[PDB]
Structure 1
């Protein structure tokens, strides 16, 4: 299985397709440039405990996307995805 993420850089709806159907089962991560990673969205729509509530995710059969309303300074970070449907589990390319 391969997952592609359509924007390569961002200068605010970040979408990612999939090779197959994944039936939910997708997480959204973010990486600060210091080197710390924490997740933002789990099971394609829910929010993590301790996130600003401007993030939101869409849902479909195979094409998922992230929605950010307003921007901020330390919001600027590369965003990854993950399918946990079937091993081996694969990330995406990332933006920004």
Structure 2
């Protein structure tokens, strides 16, 4: 039940609206998680639901909901903490990640 996402963002600008997307293969969805990668550390989840924005993060990100496709939107890049982002679902018993930047 793989998903796909746009890799190699490499946006060095501050004002950015690249809006990383996570394409759901199955049509069920309704439960998506977004993970970020520290360059030399562990990982921490961003939004548990589609767009309810788990605490511990500045109010600057949103997991967009749309037909058979989901995306995570950034207001403006703070030129830090942007190396790798992950998207994953858990609606189906075999869970899987989403590879790509």
Structure 2: runs of 5 or more not aligned? 11-17
Tell me which residue corresponds to 1:13: 19
Is structure 2 residue 27 aligned with structure 1 residue 27? no
Number of residue pairs aligned between Structure 1 and Structure 2:
94
1:93 aligns with 99
- Counterpart position of 2:63: 57
CA distance in 1, matches of 2:28, 2:89: 7
Shift in Å at residue 94 of structure 1? 2.3
Could you tell me which residue of structure 1 aligns to residue 89 of structure 2?
A: 83
Does residue 2 (structure 1) correspond to residue 2 (structure 2)? The answer is: yes
CA RMSD, aligned part only? Answer: 1.2
**Distance between the aligned counterparts of 2:92 and 2:34, measured in 1?**
17
Deviation at 1:23?
Answer: 3.5
| Deviating 4+ runs (over 4 angstroms) | none
Q: In structure 1, list runs of 5 or more residues that go unmatched.
A: none
Alignment partners' CA distance in 2, 1:52 and 1:77: 17
Instruction: Name the structure 1 match of 2:15.
Output: none
1:22-43 per-residue CA deviation (whole Å, 9 max, x = no partner) reads 3310000001011220011111
